[PDB]
Amino acid sequence: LDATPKEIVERKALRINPAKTCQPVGAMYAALGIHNCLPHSHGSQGCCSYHRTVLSRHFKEPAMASTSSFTEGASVFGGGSNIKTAVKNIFSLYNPDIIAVHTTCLSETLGDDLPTYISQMEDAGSIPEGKLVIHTNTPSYVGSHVTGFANMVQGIVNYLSENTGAKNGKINVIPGFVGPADMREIKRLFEAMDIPYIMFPDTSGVLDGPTTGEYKMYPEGGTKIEDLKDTGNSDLTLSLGSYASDLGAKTLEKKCKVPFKTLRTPIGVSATDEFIMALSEATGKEVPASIEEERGQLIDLMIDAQQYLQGKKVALLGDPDEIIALSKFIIELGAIPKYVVTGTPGMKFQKEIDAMLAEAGIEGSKVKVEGDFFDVHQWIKNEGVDLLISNTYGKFIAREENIPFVRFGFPIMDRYGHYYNPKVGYKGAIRLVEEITNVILDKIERECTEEDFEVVR
Amino acid sequence: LDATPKEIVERKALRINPAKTCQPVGAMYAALGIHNCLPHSHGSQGCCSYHRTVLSRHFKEPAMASTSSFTEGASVFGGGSNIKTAVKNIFSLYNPDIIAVHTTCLSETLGDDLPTYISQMEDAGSIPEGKLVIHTNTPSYVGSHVTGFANMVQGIVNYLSENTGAKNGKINVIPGFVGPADMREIKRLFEAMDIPYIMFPDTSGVLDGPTTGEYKMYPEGGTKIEDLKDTGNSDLTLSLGSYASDLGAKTLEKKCKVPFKTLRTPIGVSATDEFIMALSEATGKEVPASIEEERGQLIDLMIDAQQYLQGKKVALLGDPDEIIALSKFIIELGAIPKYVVTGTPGMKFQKEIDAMLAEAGIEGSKVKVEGDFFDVHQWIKNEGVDLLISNTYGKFIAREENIPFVRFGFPIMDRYGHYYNPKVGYKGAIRLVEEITNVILDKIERECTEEDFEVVR
Amino acid sequence: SENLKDEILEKYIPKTKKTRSGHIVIKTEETPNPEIVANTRTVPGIITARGCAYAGCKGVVMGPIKDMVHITHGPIGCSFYTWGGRRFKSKPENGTGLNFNEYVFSTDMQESDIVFGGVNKLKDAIHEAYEMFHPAAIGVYATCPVGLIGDDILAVAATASKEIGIPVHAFSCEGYKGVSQSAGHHIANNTVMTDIIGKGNKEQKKYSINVLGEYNIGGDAWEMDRVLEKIGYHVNATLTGDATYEKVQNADKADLNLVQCHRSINYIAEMMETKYGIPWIKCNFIGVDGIVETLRDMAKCFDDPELTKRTEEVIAEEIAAIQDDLDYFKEKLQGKTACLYVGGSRSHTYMNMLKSFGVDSLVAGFEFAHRDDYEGREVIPTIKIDADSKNIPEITVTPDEQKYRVVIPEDKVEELKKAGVPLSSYGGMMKEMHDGTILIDDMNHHDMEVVLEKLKPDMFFAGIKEKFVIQKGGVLSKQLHSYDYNGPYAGFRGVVNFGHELVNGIYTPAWKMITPPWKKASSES
Amino acid sequence: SENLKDEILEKYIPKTKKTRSGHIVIKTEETPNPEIVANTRTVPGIITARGCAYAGCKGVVMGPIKDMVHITHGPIGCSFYTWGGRRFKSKPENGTGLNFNEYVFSTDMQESDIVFGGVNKLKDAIHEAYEMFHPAAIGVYATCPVGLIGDDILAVAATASKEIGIPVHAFSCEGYKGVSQSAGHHIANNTVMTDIIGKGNKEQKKYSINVLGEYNIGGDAWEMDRVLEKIGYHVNATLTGDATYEKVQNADKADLNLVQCHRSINYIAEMMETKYGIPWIKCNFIGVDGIVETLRDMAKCFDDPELTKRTEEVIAEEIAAIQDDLDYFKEKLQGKTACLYVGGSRSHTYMNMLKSFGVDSLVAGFEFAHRDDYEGREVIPTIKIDADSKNIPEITVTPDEQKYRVVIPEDKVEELKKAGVPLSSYGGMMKEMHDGTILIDDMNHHDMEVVLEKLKPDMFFAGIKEKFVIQKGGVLSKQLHSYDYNGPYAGFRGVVNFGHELVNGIYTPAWKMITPPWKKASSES
Numbered sequence A, B: 001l002d003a004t005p006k007e008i009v010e011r012k013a014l015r016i017n018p019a020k021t022c023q024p025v026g027a028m029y030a031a032l033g034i035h036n037c038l039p040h041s042h043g044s045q046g047c048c049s050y051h052r053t054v055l056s057r058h059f060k061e062p063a064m065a066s067t068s069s070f071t072e073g074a075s076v077f078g079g080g081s082n083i084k085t086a087v088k089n090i091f092s093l094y095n096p097d098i099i100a101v102h103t104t105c106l107s108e109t110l111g112d113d114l115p116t117y118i119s120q121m122e123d124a125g126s127i128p129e130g131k132l133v134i135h136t137n138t139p140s141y142v143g144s145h146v147t148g149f150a151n152m153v154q155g156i157v158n159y160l161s162e163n164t165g166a167k168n169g170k171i172n173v174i175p176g177f178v179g180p181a182d183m184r185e186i187k188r189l190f191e192a193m194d195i196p197y198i199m200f201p202d203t204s205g206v207l208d209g210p211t212t213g214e215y216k217m218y219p220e221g222g223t224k225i226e227d228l229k230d231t232g233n234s235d236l237t238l239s240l241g242s243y244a245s246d247l248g249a250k251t252l253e254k255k256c257k258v259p260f261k262t263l264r265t266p267i268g269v270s271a272t273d274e275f276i277m278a279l280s281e282a283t284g285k286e287v288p289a290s291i292e293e294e295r296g297q298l299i300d301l302m303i304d305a306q307q308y309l310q311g312k313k314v315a316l317l318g319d320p321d322e323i324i325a326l327s328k329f330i331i332e333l334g335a336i337p338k339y340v341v342t343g344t345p346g347m348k349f350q351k352e353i354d355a356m357l358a359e360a361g362i363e364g365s366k367v368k369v370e371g372d373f374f375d376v377h378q379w380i381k382n383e384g385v386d387l388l389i390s391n392t393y394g395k396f397i398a399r400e401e402n403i404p405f406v407r408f409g410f411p412i413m414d415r416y417g418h419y420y421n422p423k424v425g426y427k428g429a430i431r432l433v434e435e436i437t438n439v440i441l442d443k444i445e446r447e448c449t450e451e452d453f454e455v456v457r
Numbered sequence C, D: 001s002e003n004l005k006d007e008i009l010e011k012y013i014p015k016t017k018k019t020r021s022g023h024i025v026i027k028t029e030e031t032p033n034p035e036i037v038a039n040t041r042t043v044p045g046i047i048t049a050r051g052c053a054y055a056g057c058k059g060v061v062m063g064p065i066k067d068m069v070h071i072t073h074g075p076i077g078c079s080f081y082t083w084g085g086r087r088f089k090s091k092p093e094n095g096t097g098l099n100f101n102e103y104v105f106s107t108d109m110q111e112s113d114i115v116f117g118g119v120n121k122l123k124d125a126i127h128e129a130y131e132m133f134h135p136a137a138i139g140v141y142a143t144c145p146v147g148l149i150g151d152d153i154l155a156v157a158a159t160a161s162k163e164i165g166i167p168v169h170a171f172s173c174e175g176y177k178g179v180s181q182s183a184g185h186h187i188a189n190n191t192v193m194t195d196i197i198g199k200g201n202k203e204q205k206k207y208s209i210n211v212l213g214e215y216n217i218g219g220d221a222w223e224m225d226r227v228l229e230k231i232g233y234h235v236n237a238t239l240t241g242d243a244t245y246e247k248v249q250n251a252d253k254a255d256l257n258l259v260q261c262h263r264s265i266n267y268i269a270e271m272m273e274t275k276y277g278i279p280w281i282k283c284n285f286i287g288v289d290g291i292v293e294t295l296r297d298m299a300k301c302f303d304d305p306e307l308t309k310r311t312e313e314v315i316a317e318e319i320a321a322i323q324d325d326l327d328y329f330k331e332k333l334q335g336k337t338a339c340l341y342v343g344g345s346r347s348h349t350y351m352n353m354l355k356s357f358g359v360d361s362l363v364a365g366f367e368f369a370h371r372d373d374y375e376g377r378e379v380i381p382t383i384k385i386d387a388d389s390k391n392i393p394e395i396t397v398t399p400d401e402q403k404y405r406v407v408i409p410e411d412k413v414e415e416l417k418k419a420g421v422p423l424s425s426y427g428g429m430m431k432e433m434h435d436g437t438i439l440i441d442d443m444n445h446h447d448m449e450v451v452l453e454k455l456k457p458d459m460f461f462a463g464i465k466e467k468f469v470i471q472k473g474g475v476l477s478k479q480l481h482s483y484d485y486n487g488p489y490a491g492f493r494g495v496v497n498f499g500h501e502l503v504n505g506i507y508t509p510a511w512k513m514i515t516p517p518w519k520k521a522s523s524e525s
Ligand code: CFM
Pocket: C055, C056, C060, C086, C181, C182, C215, C217, C261, C262, C263, C264, C342, C343, C344, C345, C346, C347, C480, C481, C482
């Protein structure tokens, strides 16, 4: 699985094997986090097929979205006419309570003003009694899917957040670009500390779920319009991801004036503790015996497995929020983050990683923001690493250089059941320690000599 | 990982690589499911040590127990004096609320009359107020560790579960010789249902547990002695799995006529649906959405991974009660049970999984009660199987014969974390569909040719 | 007939009801095979299956050639979503050679490239790709912003070619062209035809065959070429899959062209007949009947009994090992009903195969194909162009003065006449569809749910978006695009893989256990 | 003062306190080397870690000989618990060599067997094993009921042996025998000496040395022999290790016997000298000090200039080899406190290796060791027996006449003075130990806890059941029996394994993360 020059070359313009994808699919993900939402791609129709096909492949599930299917002509006459028609065949045929719209390269390059287009459909009675249209602007040539997520969170606060003068004693949570299982786990934790919330997006009963025998275009998870409106009357917002929940955070607080705190995505001991600590300093809730047990069973696993988790150098690629907090966990475990890469941009990834290594006296590690898989493979060829944690395309390096691989991130389009596991919390972290220990011990028991092979490890 | 003939040698005397251990460990285990109880091997010294070592090496947790530390002289004058000294030293130095005594082949061949030594101790004031020594006769040259568990649980109804007339509204549930995570899940489906219960034994806050950074000789989980007493006046007793659970259930039903219900260990669709249905039928109440959904997600996962599942031949090796429930679940996954062995004696296992393959139309199967690991490897030498699901020693067959293998049962001593997730319910069936599928996909991903390597699967 | 058209059209708002209408045709003997309206705009806000022009050019025709770096000009997702999605198989030419199937090369456009068009980032990325990997040629493909930001990817490739000394081919396939990926095929077929077929030297062998339009998805071509290697035919070029640039270049060292997929390669099938006199045949290596016929037809175009004798020998030999399974397959599957929906051609080929198992294809249709794929090649004199289709340049071919020959004289008309050997003809799908059969062009999410709820098919063959919709309601969607990660589904050997996969998929145990005990019975426990 | 002894004792019912005091001692100045009562019977209902006779005869000593079928005569738990837990690594002799290491054989006793004797099952199982496997010897091992039930395994064995041809060897170690695993090491040792050991016919070699009482745990013996092999000695038997039954039968064809574990085969060392004239030295290959003097004293006995400098050559080259990390291990590990409780040799052998690091031992005991092991082989006249215990065969031998030889002339007493080469002597544990230290024969869970909570060590070495009590309380415990499934810990390369494992044990971060930030000062405010 080869032909990478071992000899490192630095490339200026040829992007090979990217460790990111384009904004619209993050924006499609987040919009599927609203109940009775049907995402709309406003640009050519190629972009819709591609993004719904990746969402189905990673969750073995349906992504449903519609297009202003742009032709030759919209390059001359905009996409006004296109979303107008699109909205009439949507509401007529398959009616969402909300159409959440986002754009592609085309609409951003052509200068499409879907603020006036919406007001036109609206004035023109093309939006029925009581229904609605929301939009965000997801330009493909800046940022990545984390940024499309982060922008759709803002467009929905911007259209829907209200301070109607009456505070709920709820805390708003924006879970970041995490999967249904992590939203579901954090809801599990709120409620364990007995704190009412409003969590948006909420892919929970949308991108996992039951084969019951009836199909619904609008599954029943996601946030209800009414609750998305009530976010303006909360006491606090908690952003779980400075790259993904923060535009929202700010935009809710500049608009409804509901103040926000930014935490790290809750992966591993350090960042999961500061998550329960944020829930205490805020409501004043005493932390139960249960979560206490959960913390300690991570500590007995971390400690019992310790021989295998010590001095293991790891290559990690992914999205900024999840890889920053997972690199903290890898340090906490005993291991060394040797190659830390994100395709998605931003200084903060790189200088947060820099002072966790520097902090821990780890040296020789390479931190690359805006790097791909061709970079990390060339690295492995001049300096072999001990574990690989990556989304599904990590497997090509892991079979060439026989490396223990742990699939993590978006996109994993490979194994079945993975979307039912948390990676957040102490439960998620237990499951991580467990698969990291097993892929390692798997390789050992395969590699070793007959005579030199054990029964208790 | 040598020496086994291809050419089958059906032995009548030489046992080789067995699929069982003797009685005392299940009884030891069972005793750790009582709160503030110290297990005691009434007999031979090295037995206690060996038995406390399989629990410490499976769970990576302490298993405490004391010995009568018999000598040559107890083989003349009885082991009475030996237990009488031990009762004293146990209460003074380590102070249990209850001491659960069970026996070994030495005292059992010696014919050592425990109930009269017991009588002697507090008729001669030896066992203090609020303290108890309870007991079961455990002849290691009979049955296995499931028989041991069976026997400790009927000794615990015999000494404790009394009917005072002041009847609770509870149903009692005996979980079988299942793990602390299995006992945790069966409590939690009851919590999703509102049914009040008493589960005994319960190794949940015990053989899996958190590093406090304090060592407590009596961990906090386990059935309380006040709860084991009101096991005599409850509305029903369900016993999960015949070989382990029926004995206490029938004996309770006899001293206090409390009904009992025998249902299988809840692994996969039939056994879980039925457990659930049983709680429903019996209590009048209806099944919650939480469960409908865990159920839906299971059927959906078995339907999405279905491609892989259909027609895989499986070699199963484990315990009677769970391999009965597990073979039915590979039968509903679409795989064939080819080689189903249990080491532990009993007709039922023959009979039940026999029926299971006639109403399924599966042929070519070697099901064998009271077999061993040598037998299944010799069979595989003749026509290979696609998956192996045994404890840790089946790994020698796996490596040697390049068979996918998932560890299951007693004892898994190679890995970390296993002990914290179930194999029971909808969850543990999701979990199991996940792990048999990854093991099969990982294999093919490893052994295909480089142009047969796939990216979506 | 017309009655299901009303169940489907009932719900549409009338302007969409009008447009949509010509795309749903029901076959009646009465209307002995009719006209469908294929290849116009997709309607906005309808949920369709369809793609972009780039998806047929970089995605499907060009992507397959194994030793050319294929680089994308535009933002990252156009490259990302081509990275192992469609599974065409390569292995390097004869153990040595290049193979680039595993990577995706891009120019990852950024905002400064969108405002100050990234043409040196192409110049640079072109020189970079060449220095690193020194490939057979480099292909530059255009994405939606290249066109509008005015980047002349064509000129940049021309300079590039001369400094870099390698063929550098530029392809304008901006996703806002045509109406679907069918348009994309046309754009790619032109540059190949002009500046790569014909250029080259490798002298021809006897019985040189080319299979045209076969992207070797899941091994299929390795399977056809197994059976043909086996007769003594020299397949000179599969046009694409595992195709070397050097093997496309010498695709005129052939005798017959065997168009497997007509919708993507017919432009070349046609232009070759004209420049070199290499007649095309419509061939079908999917399903047994299709296959036996394809073998007997091409053996009739070639002249000789030694080669006809061996064809009959290997025909026999082959289907006899495959036999007891064929039988098995039928017994499990007879009486069942299928509906089929792929793009371009797979709703048609997979039909003979399903008759072989006693399955009835009630409904069928394409998400991007044209009128002659349904009706016949005949109707091509007859077509209403308002459209948006291959209003994309069309090019003309004149006899190659030197390499023009007529390889069969006029017993070619004795082929077409006698025993109906399909010399330069196709008579589409509709032709083959049973009576009381429905055809739906660019069938959307609405349309398949009344076909599903009214009609109850036992299986439904579509793709990925669509797979989990059908499956969720309790009916079996197998995807005919990506084989459900299996393969071959072509040839005698594929036929038996397709057979079991389907058998296994219907007899899947969990299908029957979707409804719980307390719902379907113990409603109050 | 050191009221730790007094602290341990004070909670003890007073009949217990009087047996228990003799067990704990303090070595101190006035008292260099105090008496300790050792090989006492175990007190009932005190958590002791001690095993049974069978663990020591069948699991420990005989167990490692890899081409005998060692069949447990008794119920199934006795055979199951010797299935791979004791980590003697074995490897087939020279490729085609029988190895039964990954198997566990049994006549699994039953009910009918107790009431009628499974003496007949043992007869049939022996030729089932021989037939199926064809061993070198077959071994019979007796559990608790076998003594009780009347099956005389000795007589079945001897008979079947004649039938079969092969050596069937019956060993009575019914676990109610003795007071611990020691009883098993005496039982095994007579039989192997009497009817296995000087039965071969190899023509002894140049510098035939033997390692005795080495079972090869995690390749320890393989590292011992690679240093010894380098130098020029020919190791001839390791007694039991990775031993063929055959090089045990030829254990007599050495000049010098290196005893590594003194508690286990000191009976062999003894009788071997007395029948054949072969002197033993007390060797130690754990710790760089332990190993360099072993080597030097070995050279003192094969007084041979090249051999005596070859030792000096290889020692130095090999310490350069592990130098840089031995003094890294130190940078991080000096200043730390250690306590050791192991079986009957290791608590003493590791004691130099800790010191080499700068880690001090503070408390140390043994499970089943005796007075010569805590105190020195000299008190062997002062010891007298029964704990409840000893009805263990005291075998006795006569020198061969035709095969006894003076390997060292009385030069031996030159050497017992001459830097006292520990030739046929052993000064136990207490004299490597420093002042104000504690020794604790047969430690309970109560004792460990008092020690642990009063002295608060940094590491505590022990084994699988202690391992987890000690670290749940949050202190490092590594295992000195199983090596924590890595090794060698012995050797030269074997130093480095311990050091790194150990420092990676101390510097594990979850140690420091046990307290949640709230119940710390952050959860009542
Ligand atoms: S949907 Fe083929 S005209 Fe084209 S990717 Fe599939 S039914 Fe395409 S047969 Fe081909 S290899 Fe295809 S399966 Fe013509 S090439 S734009 Mo999706």
